[PDB]
Design a binder for this molecule. Sequence first.
Ligand code: A1B3D
Ligand code: ZN
Length: 140
Amino acid sequence: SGAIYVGNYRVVNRHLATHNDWANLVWEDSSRDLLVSSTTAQGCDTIARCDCQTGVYYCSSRRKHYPVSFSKPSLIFVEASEYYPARYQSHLMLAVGHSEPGDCGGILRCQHGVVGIVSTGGNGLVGFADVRDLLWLDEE
Ligand SMILES: CSc1ccccc1CC(=O)N1CCO[C@H](C(N)=O)C1
Ligand SMILES: [Zn+2]
């Protein structure tokens, strides 16, 4: 679990969006596993606006922050699960690292801020849903 809090927005994995989130929807994209909901209180996360391919992610299943090299956002095939049928997920970045289902929501960060959140994994890999292209997150 985990979320990004920037301005009056809460960014979470779409598959983990609570009942309170859909009743306050701003934007969602199933093909990106992302959902953004409005918040009453202002958040303090800064979104990165860069093309960094190295960063640090939080892994809840190990209670540890790991440094990683990650690929550029891409259209990647993601195996069927209890949340989605087998499909291509867009704006996905992969890294060699540990992850388990309960790890989605963990933040990936570089020297410029929040890059994205854990969204996929398996086989000694971890996938992150990129948020750096969502320029509107900086304004309202
Ligand atoms: C850190 S996720 C993980 C890790 C190890 C093994 C398996 C998983 C689960 C996983 O990859 N998915 C289930 C939830 O929906 C995801 C999606 N964005 O389509 C995909
Ligand atoms: Zn950066």
